[PDB]
Design a protein around this ligand. Structure first.
Ligand SMILES: NC(=O)c1cc(CNCCCCOCCNc2nc3cc(C(N)=O)ccc3c3cnccc23)cc(OC(F)(F)F)c1
Length: 327
C-alpha cells in the first residue's frame, strides 16, 4: 500500500503543544452580542455560508460577517480554534467576534474589514515589484500558520485580500484549514480545482503544509506569465493532465512510484507521454517585464510533483527573487 510521509518542517508542533491548542472539539465558544452588528450589504455566497459587509454600532467600524448555512452550523469549532490560535499573526485575518444570527439561528463569525481596491482589473495591472512584495506578504502568513501547526488548504486569489492603497494583505477563509499531525490521513477534497496539488489529484492522503506551497506556485505562475489559471483543467482528472503537459510524465511516474501510489486506471486513456517543458516556453513580449531568471528559478522550486521536494515557506523567503523587496 501507500508509503507513509511526514512534513520535513514543523512536524511535531501539535504533539509538543498542550491538547487545548489543537483539540478544537473540546473548545468552549464564548458568544458575543449579535445586537452590536448591523448588516449593510451582501458580499457573496458560497456552498456553506454567506458573507456581508456590516457595521459594529459600538465603535462605528466596518466589519465582515460570515453567516453559516444550517448544514455547516455544527462544524465551526475547527475554524474558530484555528482563527483564535493564529490571531495577531502576520497578515492573518483577525476574528473580531462570534455571535448567533437572529434570523438564520446559526453561528456568525465577525471579521476585520479590509478596504478592497477592485479585482476586475487591479490585480492584472500589478507591477513586477508589486508581485514580489505581495508574494513575500503571503509567505509571512504561510510560514506563520505552518509554524503554528496549521495548513490553510485553500490558498487561491479569492482568499487573498489586498488593500493596494495601504499595501496591506490578509490571508482569509480558514474554513478548510486543519491541524497538521504527522501520519494523519486527510481528506483530498480540499482546495479549488486549479490550485490542487498533485498529491490531492492522485488521491494521496498523507499530505502536509507543502500543499499550500503548490497552490502558491499556481498563483505565482499565473501572475508572472499572465495566464489565468496557469493549469486550466476541465475536471479533477484533466487537471492532472494539464500539469503533466508542463512538468512531464516521467517525474509524475517517479513521484507515484516513490510513494507506492497506484494511479486511478481512468488516467490510462488521458495521461499520454509528455516531456518536461522549459519555463521560457511561457515567456512572451507581453509578460517579459514580470519575468526574471530569479522568478523562474523560484517558480521551479515550488511547482514540483514531490511534495517533500518543494520549498518550505521559510526557505521561499530566503530566495533571491525577494532580494529587491524592501525589508
Ligand atoms: N491573481 C489574482 O488576480 C490575485 C487577486 C487578488 C485579489 N483577490 C481578492 C478576492 C476578494 C474576495 O472577496 C471576498 C468577499 N469579501 C470579504 N470576505 C471576507 C471573508 C473572510 C473569511 N471568511 O475569513 C474574512 C474577511 C473578509 C473580508 C474582509 N474585508 C472585506 C471583504 C471581505 C490577490 C492576489 O494575490 C496576490 F498574489 F498577492 F497578488 C492575486
Amino acid at each position: 500500500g501507500p508509503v507513509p510521509s511526514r512534513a520535513r518542517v514543523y512536524t511535531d508542533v501539535n504533539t509538543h503543544r498542550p491538547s487545548e491548542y489543537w483539540d478544537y472539539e473540546s473548545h468552549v465558544v464564548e458568544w458575543g452580542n449579535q445586537d452590536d452588528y448591523q448588516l449593510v450589504r451582501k458580499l457573496g455566497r458560497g456552498k456553506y455560508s454567506e458573507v456581508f459587509e456590516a457595521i459594529n454600532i459600538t465603535n462605528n467600524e466596518k466589519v465582515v460577517v460570515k453567516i453559516l448555512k444550517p448544514v455547516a452550523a455544527a462544524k465551526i469549532k475547527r475554524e474558530i480554534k484555528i482563527l483564535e490560535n493564529l490571531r495577531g499573526g502576520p497578515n492573518i485575518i483577525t476574528l473580531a467576534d462570534i455571535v448567533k444570527d437572529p434570523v438564520s439561528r446559526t453561528p456568525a463569525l465577525v471579521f476585520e474589514h479590509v478596504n478592497n481596491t477592485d479585482f476586475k482589473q487591479l490585480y492584472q495591472t500589478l507591477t513586477d515589484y508589486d508581485i514580489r512584495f505581495y508574494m513575500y506578504e503571503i509567505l509571512k502568513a504561510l510560514d506563520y500558520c505552518h509554524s503554528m501547526g496549521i495548513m490553510h488548504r485553500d490558498v487561491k486569489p479569492h482568499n487573498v485580500m489586498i488593500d493596494h492603497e495601504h499595501r496591506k494583505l490578509r490571508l482569509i477563509d480558514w474554513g478548510l484549514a486543519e491541524f497538521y499531525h504527522p501520519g494523519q490521513e486527510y481528506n483530498v477534497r480540499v482546495a479549488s480545482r486549479y490550485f490542487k496539488g498533485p498529491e490531492l489529484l492522485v488521491d494521496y492522503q498523507m499530505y502536509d503544509y507543502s500543499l499550500d506551497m503548490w497552490s502558491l506556485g499556481c498563483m505565482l505562475a499565473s501572475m508572472i506569465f499572465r495566464k489565468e489559471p496557469f493549469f486550466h483543467g476541465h475536471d479533477n482528472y484533466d487537471q492532472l493532465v494539464r500539469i503533466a503537459k508542463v512538468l512531464g510524465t516521467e517525474d509524475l511516474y517517479d513521484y507515484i512510484d516513490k510513494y507506492n501510489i497506484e494511479l486511478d486506471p481512468r488516467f490510462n486513456d488521458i495521461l499520454g507521454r509528455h516531456s518536461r517543458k522549459r519555463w521560457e516556453r511561457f515567456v512572451h513580449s507581453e509578460n517579459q517585464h514580470l519575468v526574471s531568471p530569479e522568478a523562474l528559478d523560484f517558480l521551479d522550486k515550488l511547482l514540483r510533483y514531490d511534495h517533500q521536494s518543494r520549498l518550505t515557506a521559510r526557505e521561499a523567503m530566503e530566495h533571491p527573487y525577494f532580494y529587491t523587496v524592501v525589508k
